[PDB]
Amino acid sequence: GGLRFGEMERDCMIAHGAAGFLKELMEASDAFRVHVCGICGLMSVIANLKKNQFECRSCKNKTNIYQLHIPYAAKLLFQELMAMNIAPRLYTERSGVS
Amino acid sequence: IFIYQNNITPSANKMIPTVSPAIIETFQESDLVVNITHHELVPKHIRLSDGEKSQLLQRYKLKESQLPRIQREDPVARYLGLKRGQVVKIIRRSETSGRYASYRICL
Amino acid sequence: LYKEILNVIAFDGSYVNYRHMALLVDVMTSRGYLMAITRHGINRADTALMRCSFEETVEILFEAGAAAELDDCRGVSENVMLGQLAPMGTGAFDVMIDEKLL
Amino acid sequence: QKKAMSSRAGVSQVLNRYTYSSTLSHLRRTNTPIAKPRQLHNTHW
Amino acid sequence: MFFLKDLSLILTLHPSYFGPQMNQYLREKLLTDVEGTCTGQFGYIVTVLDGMNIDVGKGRIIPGSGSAEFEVKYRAVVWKPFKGEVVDAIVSNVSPIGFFADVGPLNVFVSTRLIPDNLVYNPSNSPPAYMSNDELITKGSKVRLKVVGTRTDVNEIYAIGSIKEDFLGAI
Amino acid sequence: YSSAPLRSVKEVQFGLLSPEEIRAISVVKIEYPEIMDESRQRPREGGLNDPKLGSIDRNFKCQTCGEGMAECPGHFGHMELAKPVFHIGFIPKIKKVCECICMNCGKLLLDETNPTMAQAIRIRDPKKRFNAVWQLCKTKMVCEARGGCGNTQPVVRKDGMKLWGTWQPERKLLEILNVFKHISPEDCFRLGFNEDYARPEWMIITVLPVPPPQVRPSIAMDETTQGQDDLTHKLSDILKANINVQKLEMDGSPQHIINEVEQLLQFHVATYMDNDIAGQPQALQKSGRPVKAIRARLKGKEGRLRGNLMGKRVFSARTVISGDPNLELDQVGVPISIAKTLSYPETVTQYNIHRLTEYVRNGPNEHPGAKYVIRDNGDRIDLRYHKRAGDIVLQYGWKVERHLMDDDPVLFNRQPSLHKMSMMAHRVKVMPYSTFRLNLSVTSPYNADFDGDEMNLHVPQSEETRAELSQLCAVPLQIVSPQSNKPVMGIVQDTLCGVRKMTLRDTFIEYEQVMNMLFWVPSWDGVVPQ
Amino acid sequence: LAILKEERTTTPYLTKYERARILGTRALQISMNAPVLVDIEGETDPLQIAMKELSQRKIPLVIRRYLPDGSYEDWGCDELIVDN
Amino acid sequence: STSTVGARRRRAKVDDEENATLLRLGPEFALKQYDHDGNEHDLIALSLSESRLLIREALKARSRARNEIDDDELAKVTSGAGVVKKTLDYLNTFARFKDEETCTAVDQLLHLHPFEIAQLSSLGCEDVDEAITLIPSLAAKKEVLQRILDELNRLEDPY
Amino acid sequence: ALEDIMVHYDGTTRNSLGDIIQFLYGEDGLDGTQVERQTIDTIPGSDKAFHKRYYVDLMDEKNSIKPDVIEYAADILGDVELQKELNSEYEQLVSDRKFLRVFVNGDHNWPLPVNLRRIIQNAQQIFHLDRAKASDLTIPEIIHGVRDLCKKLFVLRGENELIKEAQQNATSLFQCLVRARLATRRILEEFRLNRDAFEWVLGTIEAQFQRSLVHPGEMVGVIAAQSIGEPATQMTLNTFHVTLGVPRLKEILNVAKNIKTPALTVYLDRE
């Protein structure tokens, strides 16, 4: 195994203003490349990584697609929420402004 | 500004907001025996023209809601007779700088 | 509120600098009254992913997909949950190469 | 067993064998299902 | 039909190219990635207007590696055929199933089934042509066609059309 | 590499799956309730898990979108329920909604016409609106005729997983969905809803979204032994409770003995998502096992949110501390063993190529060595196997994973971590013997002693990560603690106790020693004081 | 949005976090085989190289400081006084 | 890629009707597109020849700061070094004018929804029965247009 | 409860909503690390002993700077124009004395950025000053010089007034400490500062200060959050040896409607 970096350890780094290092939850653990849809912000996309073919029928797309880097625990958080029927849409651009 | 001794009737006061623009307030007697502002802990407040206000906001880049609030039924708020939308500059002593200047909008 | 908290630290010989207690005192106070540092307080302001990371975790999401909430992702939490650098000191800004000066 | 976990775990353990005085101790042990009880009462003498 | 749409593009740039005349390299790379592209979404990107004052804006530095991300905002001249649209180009090829025409960066094809009947496909003629009770069409000849349908493709948008209506055909 | 542009989430939109969408997205018709065995033959029946969903056994297979296990996030499938069901956690709202809307018609029970309603209707707050509203409409039960048909509205109550009411005259509301569908659009919005992302009706499920393998992985005991996840069951329990239902609605359907079988599906679907409710019936799995409901996997602490996201296990090591009086304040002796285990990705550069090509030849078993070389071609060479082990001549741009070396900034800590100082960056000093050797004066910050106490160590990985560790977390920067505007590390035990003695007027030292003493001060100017 | 080089209000000094991260970035930048604008007077560890690049204020970089409202203030590493 | 100045939020939900000379151009070409400076601006109709100029002009102030025949040359210098050549020959073997004025004139005149104001300019036309036919979006947007149609061939630069 | 609280580039302490929790962190915008327990002289002592310290009277045989301190002691005795800048000053210090009696306790020891007691002790031996031969400062040199200083001890920077007010506001307390140690009388009779020394002490107070200011970025909330909870882990659950300590803090953070010990202290009336 690997030693946990639990909450309290988080806190401290945040106190240090050690922004990047803390961000570095990703590099030392989860991390994962998921493919979202530019429209229904989901992890649907059928990304056959070679022939580039991307798609996401049902939303019938092959053109507007994004790739993101999130902790697999989180990718899972979402798949989970969905199977419980809640929809965690992931959007790459703020539209609501402020 | 009516000063009811013990209490006004529920039939009565239900006729206050019935004469705008003008506005009316109600103060119990036993609650004005001692001026509350006079208290040690009570720091000095102050009203603000819709000019001095529309200034604070520009000067700090505030969206009104982002400003510390104060209750309409707040002891001091009543004393100076505030209204929903008015601002108040508080100026108290500070063991760190001497005097700090805070502001509370009245929700 | 301050005086009382201070006298609770100070009744133990320990010393803390004003600014600290004050900040707490102030946070509880500012929204208008006495917002308690409890599930029935700060965790109930206009601050979904966030509040979801403390106590009512699931229902907080349910009634979030229910009313179709939109989350800024301005909360320290959101970003940790996402795996992105959070707007925290070091990340509270951007860094760009000036071609002109380069 | 059954859909009855509404029991108590602890009764019957794995006898210590680190040292002799370890084993003795283990057998002469008492439990108590859950600031005043933890106290060393007089009656305890 | 030709338009002037205000687009933008993102280019990541390796730190190597962080010289004094960088603005320059982005720009020239911009061109290598835009002028000549083709999306059914935006059509045929053919030319970037007002080069000189291209907009680069400050670019941000990607965290992992070192590259900088620039959102170049320009404006260019594009062209994307619509259905029902009417234009005319030079006939390019011609078989038994019809003939293909060329309107600008495009190639629209006309079916022997989308022409006026009395115009049959010529057998052994050079170069292979079409004969009418009076007209004759071959490579060279200019035709004015109507674009019935449009199929978006790779880095090229082709379409189809007919000259069965009126005021269409040779000129 | 993925050609698709890389972006970061700047916004999250919540809502509820519209049945038509789940259908759209599904890649599996999911009709069968078993797993695979083509009659004992191992594969994956086109029935359950992988009737095109994700996959097991290290087989790219997965609808040719290959990728095999790692790279392929899961793939959702669905399942057409025989009859509409209540979404276990919304059953509350589904009910408060009806309490606010009329049936047989489907419109609000208070229009702009009612004054107290105008107010509620102006309350801008998707939640407090639907709050104030219900506090009104839960009283009036006469669909007053504006809209028409004053049919008296029933008083609804909660009994297990069913909503029933009285007009008495008691009836068990099945019907609901229909009424909701009819509810007006400006009305969805009147209550706490959103016509695009979540319409009141979708609080009832028609077609059930079936989550894929990575979600409910199977754990086989080698090959010829079962091993299936918890959820991969209450999916099947549901599936089965669906099958029988339908096979009672296309055959001698004893119309009042079906409902007795509908309530079952309503339940298994309540289960699947939530299995910790009011109307007891824990719903235990053969053995007594409670059966973790999806929502159980999330409950704060241990559960995904607070257990896997706000904090995860993470280039780290931990052992027993014992202080060393010959280590600069900021150092931290690391057991060779550990340094030979923790690496550091240093890109090849014409300043360090020479040294790196040496460290690499050195192999993963010599201390000042390395253990992995990664070429531009996103692939890794294992310095302890690769037939070209001692071969390799690097290429600028390649990265090499070397053994931690002296003077590598690293995060050293001792929890409980309740200080900014419970974690500090130290200079690395590889030393022998199995223990982290820290300086005494840096004792009280972590608050450790050597009676067995252990310490966690983390290793930065980026060029900046390191810098961030040395420019703000270096032990020296920490000497003056902001919490009490005074230092927070002094001279403890022996050094203190003795420094006292040595000071007294009675304490005198002669040349022989006054010399060996000056020698021990490293900065010594090289001048013996008169 | 924007904000002229004029009417700029923020500190003319560099926040510990700014410096820390600047040196951070520029450091890995250099280790990414980037180009340096000083005299590696025999130096070889990027963070050193960058520390120098700082003292001679030749690090082409700009800090876009954000205000709670959303606007910003750009400052060059050359400008920003580096007390600390 | 390369996205335009029309960033809508495609939230999950398949609503792109057919494209026809019913003046229903893609959503990316609505009579109201948005300017780079964050302003509102009318689409940009570009009939042939008029197109031939915008092009020739940029390829030139380009081969400036960079330092059938008279255009094939300016190309193999400022061009990536094929689509344009074609769009230039064609746009030059069909362009209906020559002087930046003769082109100004057509526009100072004609200026209908952008697509038309252009088609009318790049397409030869005599009768209204004809224009209204090859530009089926008109029909009721201008009584039998005939004058104008003449005024074109009257300024129809010689070749 | 404070996670998202961090000083902002304008010097506002806000959160993930921009909601201003404090307009100037700590009511001064100073980083606790750079602060030490100083003693505001002015406040303590008798009106008698006060005057004999900061009072200077060029129009008086007994209350004037002996020409053994200044280098123009005799050529200065009696100047009306100077005795006025000397009034502005002495009249100030008195405004202070009465303004500090903020601390109705009289306790003159408080945490304040820039340690002036030492900063001067550094001049002390950097230029080696003798408790004998006179200084060389115009009375304008001193007085005028300390005013020019106050001008550069900038915390907030804004162009307008509301800001410029905040400036003066969140500073004051310091300035008083500043005057207290830079009154002509002390600066010449107590720590014989040369013209040189003074220009140095000044320049440093200024510099030091600017470093002692808080940095925008400082994740303030998590800081104070811990700073408070930490010295709590070190207390006993016991309320022995009024409800206090551990359980009390609890009581408070909960905003309890019925504390164990309510109690209430009332003081007599003035007389």
Ligand SMILES: [Zn+2]
């Ligand atoms: Zn979609």
Ligand SMILES: [Zn+2]
């Ligand atoms: Zn797949």
Ligand SMILES: [Zn+2]
């Ligand atoms: Zn009705």
